């Protein structure tokens, strides 16, 4: 069911109302982008015809990692190979402790590689001092994790005197066979990640070390993958000049809305995502799942309920465990898809351009 103005149920007419809203605006925005790859593909295809900008909700976490690797590069590994091969694991921050990943590592020793079957050492920087899982915790510096990360690299480079807290940590890291530093780029920051990735480059002068960059839970990592092969650049790209302009600052939806540059915006949230709270200020088109609380017609000017991928309809989603795009079939599900709506709005916008 759809909603236009005061509760207009018709799905076809809601597509026409969304096409009229996007055509009348000069600066359009496509925020959210938490859905299937087919919907992301249709959203980027619509923005190319519209001349709009895009910004996933995972924006800050995505560009915290992208900002450090587009300038400094990366030395990374996967979750399965960390559980399978790593003998010493450094856990930076509190966010990696949320998932079951930390318990899977502790429960079983590595099963593959040179260090398979050896005793596993778990070191933590900035994590809780007392945990159910036994680990060696190292106190974070007063400045923060980013200051601690730079502090730690100095001991690893041999630039700072011995007998310090991070000096023992540096000694334990270099004495490795398969080293993995697990961190969340959101909480660590662009500068800390580039430092963290540099610390790994210094560690690889002696033994093999890698980074387990944590993934966002709002499909942002798949949006990067798709946008990269569709536009040639990362997300936050604008098509005002028919060519994809990448500008992490200019096409930041949070920045655009607060300044007042964007007239209209399209919200893509087939899977649960945090509400942006600006939907009421400017005319918005909300493509959301049927189960979500955002289904009601008060949230946005035009609201279209689509099929939740992995629950009511099939779709290729980012797999948290696997670390790649995988197709998730519907768990006990004719309903409309977010890709089918964005394509129909694009077809109606093209139809208006001819006559």
């Amino acid at each position: 069911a759809a909603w236009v103005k005061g509760g207009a149920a018709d799905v076809d007419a809601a597509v026409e109302a969304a096409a009229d809203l996007l055509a009348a605006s000069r600066v359009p925005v496509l925020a959210g982008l938490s859905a299937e790859v087919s919907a992301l593909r249709a959203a980027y295809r619509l923005a190319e015809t519209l001349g709009a900008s895009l910004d996933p909700v995972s924006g800050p976490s995505v560009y915290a990692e992208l900002g450090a690797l587009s300038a400094g590069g990366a030395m990374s590994t996967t979750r399965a190979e960390t559980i399978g091969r790593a003998d010493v694991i450094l856990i930076v921050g509190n966010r990696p402790w949320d998932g079951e990943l930390i318990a899977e590592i502790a429960a079983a020793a590595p099963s593959r590689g040179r260090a398979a079957g050896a005793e596993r050492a778990l070191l933590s920087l900035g994590g809780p001092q007392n945990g159910a899982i036994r680990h060696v915790a190292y106190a974070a510096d007063a400045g923060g994790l980013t200051i601690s990360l730079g502090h730690l690299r100095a001991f690893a480079k041999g630039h700072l005197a011995g007998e310090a807290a991070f000096a023992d940590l540096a000694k334990r890291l270099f004495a490795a066979q398969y080293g993995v530093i697990v961190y969340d780029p959101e909480e660590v920051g662009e500068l800390g990640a580039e430092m963290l990735q540099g610390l790994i480059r210094d560690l690889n002068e002696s033994t093999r070390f890698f980074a387990l960059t944590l993934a966002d839970p709002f499909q942002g990592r798949a949006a990067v993958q798709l946008s990269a092969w569709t536009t040639g650049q990362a997300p936050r790209v604008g098509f005002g000049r028919h060519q994809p302009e990448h500008d992490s600052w200019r096409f930041d939806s949070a920045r655009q809305i607060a300044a007042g540059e964007a007239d209209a915006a399209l919200w893509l949230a087939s899977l649960p995502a945090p509400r942006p709270a600006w939907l009421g200020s400017l005319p918005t088109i909300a493509i959301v799942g049927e189960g979500s609380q955002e289904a009601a017609g008060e949230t946005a000017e035009v609201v279209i309920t689509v099929g939740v991928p992995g629950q009511s309809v099939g779709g290729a989603l980012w797999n948290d465990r696997r670390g790649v795009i995988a197709y998730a079939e519907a768990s006990d599900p004719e309903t409309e898809t977010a890709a089918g709506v964005l394509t129909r709005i694009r077809d109606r916008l093209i139809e208006k351009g001819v006559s």
Binding site: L69, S76, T78, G113, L226, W229, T231, G232, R241, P244
Partner: protein, 542 residues
């Protein structure tokens, strides 16, 4: 719809045709000359007519190709495209590489690094490439599953079941191997690896894995032989590694990828000599062997390879000084940007060896032309290499600017033979399709797919092959006078093979204990693609 293309010099080396004549195509396929009036007639004044270009080795899709566009947003120039097809002029995008291949007359492009782990995202990326038909080569030889099978000695039957399962689940055209065991050795602290060197934790050579994959490929019957990425890429002395790997095949059908990077002589026991003559000699002594060159193009580019062992070795030579190495699951991948200096003593030799290998070949069908895009160079330079092979006076024009080392360490200025159109058709259409097993693509005889490339004659072959007068995809015109007119999606070629039911349940228990997820995360369902069941086209196994 009946179409008649007369007046042009039709070049088809598989039938022996190098003379002007008619080409009749009906219902998207080449038919015998019908004595009835055709619906449309295409006039080619001169305009040498060739088959659809086939690309065998080009890094066009994958997680690593995504990473390269993130690391180097400046690599490919995006021009303003008013009234142009979406993303066709957006430099680096899948649509950009698709449209640019069609402009040169190429209608088929094969991806050599299809990872079985991230198969869906690689195929979703391949599907988004427009116009061309595409293919993916499943990569084996570095995943724990196959290596545990070889470590225990499960037998040639058991290995066949696993190679069949992976080919089916990943929807790949053929089998590839990128430095067998090099990844499972780099993860265990190994930096250099040779074809015989024992790899840690499995106690096996890389020839042991290659010989096992060579058995499986012959047994299953893949029309394309084993696509092989040898040991010690780019290291002085790889001529010794490629040759010993060729002799390790024991007469089996193989294909060496980007062999140019291996023809580096050892000379003094600080420098390196060209080994093109040594490799071309071994290629004639082994008739079952084939190889694609991988010619080096001067300028800024990026090297995308799943040989993490070698990409980590040359990581410090990256220009700009930034690199992404990922060691994950099987091989992961390594992306380091590289600039081939326009006057560089190393770059000029690499550029000379690429041509020398092609100029020495007796049969260009076995010496397929590639750039190893983008590792060696950008694929848009194919018209230049064709111009350099066909024209001897332009080859000496380029050699005049390069330093003396080119003549003193290669011998390319001494070999002054020109290449013909029939031999260029062996490089770009005939040879590549015969290798890949696509019987209906390399030629223009009655029975072929209507993939036609018409180039307007020019003394400057660079312009002749850069903008094709007319290119046809299954009978429909896609580009005219070098500009794309049509915009539709092709089909991904996947070998039709059935996964063993007893092997599928055996792999399921393995994947659940290593990853925590079933086969569905590795599967490539039709419902994920924009064209449900219309994205793939079956290929029969010989």
């Amino acid at each position: 719809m009946l179409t008649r293309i007369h007046g042009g010099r039709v070049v088809d080396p598989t039938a022996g045709r190098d003379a002007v004549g008619d080409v009749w195509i009906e219902d998207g396929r080449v038919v015998a000359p019908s004595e009835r009036a055709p619906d449309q007639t295409i006039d080619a004044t001169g305009c040498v007519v060739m088959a659809g270009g086939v690309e065998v080795h080009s890094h066009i899709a994958g997680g690593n190709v995504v990473m390269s566009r993130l690391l180097l947003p400046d690599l490919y120039v995006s021009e303003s495209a008013p009234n142009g097809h979406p993303f066709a002029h957006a430099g680096g995008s899948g649509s950009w590489i698709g449209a640019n291949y069609a402009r040169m007359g190429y209608t088929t492009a094969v991806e050599p690094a299809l990872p079985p782990s991230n198969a869906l995202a690689t195929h979703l990326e391949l599907a988004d490439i427009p116009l061309l038909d595409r293919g993916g080569l499943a990569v084996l030889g570095n995943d724990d599953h196959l290596l545990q099978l070889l470590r225990d000695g499960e037998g040639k039957q058991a290995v066949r079941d696993l190679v069949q399962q992976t080919l089916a689940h990943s929807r790949g055209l053929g089998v590839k191997c990128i430095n067998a065991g090099g990844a499972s050795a780099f993860k265990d602290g190994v930096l250099k690896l040779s074809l015989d060197d024992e790899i840690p934790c499995y106690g096996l050579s890389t020839r042991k894995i290659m010989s096992a994959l060579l058995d499986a490929v012959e047994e299953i019957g893949v029309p394309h032989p084993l696509h092989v990425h040898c040991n010690n890429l780019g290291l002085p002395g790889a001529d010794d590694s490629l040759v010993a790997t060729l002799e390790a095949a024991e007469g089996r059908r193989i294909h060496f990828a980007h062999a140019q990077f291996y023809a580096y002589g050892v000379v003094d026991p600080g420098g390196f000599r060209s080994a093109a003559e040594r490799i071309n000699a071994a290629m004639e002594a082994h008739p079952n062997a084939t190889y694609d060159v991988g010619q080096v193009v001067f300028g800024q580019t990026v090297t995308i390879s799943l040989d993490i062992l070698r990409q980590f070795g040359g990581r410090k030579g990256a220009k700009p000084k930034k690199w992404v190495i990922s060691a994950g699951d099987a091989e992961g991948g390594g992306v380091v940007p590289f600039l081939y200096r326009p006057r560089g003593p190393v770059s000029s030799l690499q550029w000379a060896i690429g041509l020398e290998l092609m100029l020495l070949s007796s049969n260009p069908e076995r010496t397929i032309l590639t750039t190893d895009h983008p590792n060696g160079g950008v694929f848009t330079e194919y018209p230049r290499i064709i111009h350099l092979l066909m024209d001897a006076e332009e080859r000496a024009k380029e050699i005049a600017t390069l330093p003396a080392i080119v003549g003193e360490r290669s011998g390319l200025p001494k070999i002054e033979r020109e290449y013909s159109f029939s031999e260029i058709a062996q490089l770009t259409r005939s040879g590549p399709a015969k290798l890949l097993g696509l019987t209906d693509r390399g030629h223009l005889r009655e029975g072929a797919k209507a993939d036609v490339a018409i180039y307007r004659d020019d003394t400057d072959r660079t312009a002749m092959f850069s903008r094709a007068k007319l290119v046809l995809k299954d009978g429909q015109p896609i580009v005219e006078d070098g500009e794309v007119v049509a915009w539709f999606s092709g089909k991904t070629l996947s070998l039709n093979v059935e996964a063993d039911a007893g092997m599928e349940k055996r792999a399921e228990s393995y994947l659940q204990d290593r990853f925590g997820a079933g086969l569905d995360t590795f599967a490539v369902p039709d419902a994920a693609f924009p064209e449900n069941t219309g994205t793939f086209e079956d290929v029969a196994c010989r």
